[PDB]
């Protein structure tokens, strides 16, 4: 006869992504509610039992499962506790938390990316046998005002009550190797205002001005201003490096730094190619590309 | 009388060198053995006490005394602790240790600098009177691949026992001020191939470069392309300062970017001097003069 | 009497935070030890469960839980829930979650190619190979399909030892030590793409120098070509992890810093040094300097 | 210094009553777990009875339930073991033993005698007829 306990989690702020670490800092509240024995409250109303009381209660005997979350990189930083005893023997655990939670998160499409922060809550030594997660109630809250925050938490959390099974287990009592597993999935997309306007637009801006090497007169001024171009990109490249997350990956941004320095070094190759393949001879046509350049990156652009 | 303590420190690793705080980190693990009244330990056979155990033995009346890290800068990051307790009398105290330790650094001459990384070991309560080293033994492992450290350990660890008479010393009146201290040092240098390769020859090539601009023809050439040159400098001490270690003086490489800009700074009024002072034959052909004046002025910075 | 064996379990979940200058990097996951001490009464007959707080009060009380070191930990690690499982007949299972920070000889030379081995070398802290040794020891890595996303890439199941350190400086010397390592390739893309690929089009474009008319516009371009390379040494030193080595990119950027330099005396030597008569040769090095360049970069 | 002062012992015949004390001084009473332990000729120490304060805890060795009863009284820092209808078995050496972190209820699993920084020097219980 498994332990039936009844959780409830409650999300005050998620902040703090790590790219490169993949991880997320959460903080809240956790509610765990199980029935056990029946006991002898003063005055038979619910008894309250804070902190460093609840381990004094464990030491007579009191039954306080360790519920571990299984995604937390370290030891989460856990505030206020208390338990809520009733005489008919329900048992009411809460406690603040604070933690750094990890899960697989790609930010390919950064700024434009879309994640999905999860909480994996699972009993540290007890089996579905023993104890089983009836329900889960994720209460997060309604942000008015997104604009303000880097992350837009986009439709209630999900939830999701499972049996994981451990094919190396200690014990080989026939089926005690399952744990009941809670799985809280919050999406949100990524506020992408800032980069849209400090980084995507500048960096379109430095492209395009780029191209405008075609329309000066002499061969000597479309070659050296080809280099202040490619000296702008590398420019610009350190300065979108030094704010953007770290990643082990390019971006979109990345992709876009990458096709600036493609569009200027094919420039500088059609400038020489054009001064020095004739008869003689500078071409009309590929000279005159102040049209086609710009069209054959945009093609490029659109295919990418 | 004075009891007498064997001490036996092992050195695992030295990293995290702060230039600024001057403060080194160092892992490692510390023994001490002493010998005191004889015990009636389980079967006659050593007594092991671990860690949490080892406060539940001193609430009892077992002398276990503090010693301190003179020069670590906050309180050390204690890992496992043990106490072997032998029925002849004799207490061995054995426990891990990461702390971060400071010492006077001398940085100047930087990549290139020499330091050594010490270790100071004292009784925080008892003087020589009551508590003495006997004896010390550092344990350094070899650098396996020298190559990829960060600094290369030179000389085998310096040990000495000394002995500190402290001055202000509170009710301790006749004689309780002077306490045992040992002493380690560990002599390291710098692996200064990065800084070279990466640092000090490209400045030597920008600097070198710099001097091209006496080749020029044009007045208006030679004065504009010193900008350009100016804005080279100005770049690469920007590079190597968001680099190169925060100091409160100048290095090797901070003072090769002072005399990358008096180079540049001297060329422009020496440019400028030549134009309008018909440009003069010999100021124009400088291009043998400066180099040799700058190489001349750069052995009195080594020397 | 006999040592007391102790079965290990390890269970790797994840490997990150890499300090190239420490030569560091951070481990998440669970030790699991199993060995058997004298016989309880435990309630019902049935195992005991004694979790985190409890375990302290258990050994108070004379339950043997010898601690268990990891040889190459940088400072005590963060153990999160701890618990023991004591069985009648004397068996005794400690579980425990921890996160540390663990040290290795790390190469990064080869960077962003290099090739690292992730190390654990756990041992008891008082116990000798006559009172407590490892009978055996089983990691359990979890098989990563979404690799292209993570910064390394975990190239085979975890390899396993269990040795005997004999200590010298101090017949019961020896301690039983198991050593774990895993093996891992960095994953190039980024570097690829947004280090090495734009660096080779500004050191080919740095090249374009002899395809200039003039002596005046050939040799101030090359001013420009010189402070290109230092704002790229700059972009890449900002991202890339400092070591006490020159990596690939690095030497790349000194060829840089070579092949303008080199372009810079051949274009005065040109220009001052004939019978104002650029050497035919010399400024149509335009195929020479770039062959010669790359039969440098084959070195 | 401490001292765990036992009486109470001494010759018995058969089926007869005894009552233990131990006077325990040079240390906090209150906050210690002071208990019972008897030891026959060639055979090893075991537990009697053991009360807590801190706790509510209370062992009873199974060779002794229904017969003994551990009572505490801080009042005089004492503790005493009421042993009725005793038999020859029950013949040992009665020391007592005071630790600070002993738990009654773990010691009942256990049976370790290491949280026990202080002991008695014993008191002989002789039963015969």
């Known amino acids: 006869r498994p332990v039936d306990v009844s959780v409830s989690i409650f999300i005050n702020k998620i902040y703090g992504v790590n790219t490169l670490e993949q991880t997320y800092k959460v903080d809240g509240y956790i509610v765990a509610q199980w029935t056990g024995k029946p006991r002898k409250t003063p005055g038979d109303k619910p008894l309250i039992v804070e902190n460093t009381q609840i381990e004094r209660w464990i030491n007579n005997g009191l039954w306080v499962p360790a519920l571990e979350f299984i995604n937390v990189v370290g030891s989460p930083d856990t505030g206020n506790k208390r338990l809520m005893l009733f005489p008919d023997g329900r048992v009411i655990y809460n406690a603040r938390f604070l933690g750094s939670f990890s899960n697989d998160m790609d930010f390919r499409l950064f700024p434009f990316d879309r994640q999905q922060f999860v909480l994996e809550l699972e009993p540290f030594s007890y089996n579905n046998q023993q104890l089983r997660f009836s329900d889960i109630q994720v209460y997060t809250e309604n942000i008015d005002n997104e604009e303000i925050d880097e992350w837009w938490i986009r439709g209630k959390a999900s939830t999701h009550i499972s049996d994981i099974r451990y094919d190396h287990l200690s014990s080989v009592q026939p089926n005690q190797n399952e744990f009941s597993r809670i799985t809280v999935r919050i999406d949100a997309v990524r506020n992408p205002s800032y980069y849209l306007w400090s980084f995507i637009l500048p960096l379109g801006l430095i492209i395009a001005a780029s191209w405008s090497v075609f329309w000066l007169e002499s061969f000597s001024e479309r070659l050296q201003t080809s280099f202040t171009l490619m000296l702008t990109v590398v420019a610009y490249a350190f300065y979108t490096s030094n704010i953007l997350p770290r990643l082990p990956y390019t971006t979109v941004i990345d992709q876009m730094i990458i096709a600036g320095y493609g569009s200027i070094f094919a420039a500088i190759l059609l400038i020489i190619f054009a001064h020095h393949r004739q008869a003689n001879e500078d071409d009309l046509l590929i000279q005159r590309c102040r049209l086609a350049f710009p069209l054959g990156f945009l093609a490029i652009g659109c295919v990418l | 009388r004075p009891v007498d303590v064997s001490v036996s420190i092992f050195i695992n690793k030295i990293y995290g060198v702060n230039t600024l705080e001057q403060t080194y980190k160092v892992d490692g693990y510390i023994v001490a053995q002493w010998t005191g009244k004889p015990r009636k330990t389980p079967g006659d056979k050593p007594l092991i006490v671990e860690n949490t155990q080892i406060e539940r033995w001193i609430n009892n009346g077992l002398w276990v005394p503090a010693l301190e890290f003179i020069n670590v800068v906050g309180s050390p990051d204690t890992g496992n602790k043990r106490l072997m307790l032998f029925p002849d009398g004799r207490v061995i105290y054995n426990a891990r240790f990461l702390g971060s330790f400071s010492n006077d650094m001398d940085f100047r001459l930087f990549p290139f600098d020499r330091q050594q990384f010490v270790l100071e070991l004292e009784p925080f309560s008892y003087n020589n009177q009551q508590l003495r080293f006997s004896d010390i033994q550092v344990y350094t492992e070899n650098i396996d691949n020298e190559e990829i450290d960060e600094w290369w350990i030179r000389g085998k660890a310096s040990t000495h026992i000394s002995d500190i008479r402290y001055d202000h010393l509170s009710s301790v009146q006749p004689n309780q001020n002077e306490f045992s201290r040992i002493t380690v040092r560990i002599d390291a240098v710098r692996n200064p191939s990065y800084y070279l390769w990466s640092f000090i020859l490209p400045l030597g090539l920008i600097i070198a470069a710099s001097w091209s601009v006496f080749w020029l023809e044009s007045f208006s050439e030679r004065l504009q392309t010193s900008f350009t040159l100016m804005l080279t400098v100005v770049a690469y001490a920007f590079y190597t300062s968001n680099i190169l270690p925060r100091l409160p003086y100048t290095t090797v490489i901070d003072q090769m970017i002072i005399a990358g800009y008096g180079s540049i700074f001297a060329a422009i009024l020496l440019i400028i001097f030549a134009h309008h002072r018909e440009d003069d034959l010999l100021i124009q052909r400088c291009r043998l003069a400066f180099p040799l004046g700058f190489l001349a002025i750069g052995c009195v910075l080594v020397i | 009497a006999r040592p007391v064996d102790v079965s290990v379990s390890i269970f790797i979940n994840k490997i990150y935070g890499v300090n190239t200058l420490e030569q560091t990097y951070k481990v998440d996951g669970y030790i699991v030890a199993q060995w058997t001490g004298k016989p309880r009464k435990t309630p019902g007959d049935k195992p005991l469960i004694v979790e985190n707080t409890q375990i302290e009060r258990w050994i108070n009380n004379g339950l043997w839980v010898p601690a268990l070191e990891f040889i190459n930990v940088v400072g005590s690690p963060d153990t999160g829930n701890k618990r023991l499982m004591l069985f009648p007949d004397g068996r005794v299972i400690y579980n425990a979650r921890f996160l540390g920070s663990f040290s290795n000889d790390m190469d990064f030379r080869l960077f962003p190619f290099d090739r690292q081995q992730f190390v654990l070398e756990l041992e008891p802290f008082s116990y000798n190979n006559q009172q407590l040794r490892f009978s055996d020891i089983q990691v359990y890595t979890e098989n990563i399909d979404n690799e292209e996303i993570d910064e390394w890439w975990i190239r085979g199941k975890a390899s396993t030892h269990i040795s005997d350190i004999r200590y010298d400086h101090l017949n019961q010397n020896e301690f039983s030590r198991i050593t774990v390592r895993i093996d891992a390739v960095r994953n190039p893309s980024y570097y690829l793409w947004s280090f090495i690929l734009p660096l080779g089009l500004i050191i080919a474009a740095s090249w374009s120098v002899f395809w200039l008319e003039s002596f005046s516009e050939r040799l101030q371009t090359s001013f420009t070509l010189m402070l290109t390379v230092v704002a790229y040494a700059f972009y890449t030193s900002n991202i890339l992890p400092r070591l006490p080595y020159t990596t690939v990119i690095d030497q790349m950027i000194i060829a840089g810093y070579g092949s303008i330099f080199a372009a810079i005396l051949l274009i005065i030597f040109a220009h001052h040094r004939q019978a104002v008569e650029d050497d035919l040769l010399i400024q149509r090095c335009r195929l020479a300097f770039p062959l010669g360049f790359l039969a440098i970069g084959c070195v | 210094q401490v001292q765990l002062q036992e009486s109470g012992g001494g010759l018995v015949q058969a089926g007869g009553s005894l009552r233990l004390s131990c006077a325990a001084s040079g240390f906090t009473f209150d906050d210690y777990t002071i208990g019972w332990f008897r030891q026959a000729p060639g055979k090893e120490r075991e537990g009697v009875s053991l009360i807590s304060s801190s706790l509510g805890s209370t062992y009873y060795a199974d060779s002794v339930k229904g017969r003994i009863t551990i009572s505490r009284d801080n009042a005089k820092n004492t503790v005493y073991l009421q042993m009725n209808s005793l038999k020859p078995e029950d013949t040992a050496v009665y020391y007592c033993?005071?630790?600070?972190?002993?738990?009654?209820?773990?010691?009942?699993?256990?049976?370790?005698?290491?949280?026990?920084?202080?002991w008695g020097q014993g008191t002989q219980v002789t039963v015969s007829s």
């Open positions: 033993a005071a630790g600070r972190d002993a738990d009654p209820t773990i010691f009942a699993i256990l049976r370790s005698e290491y949280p026990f920084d202080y």
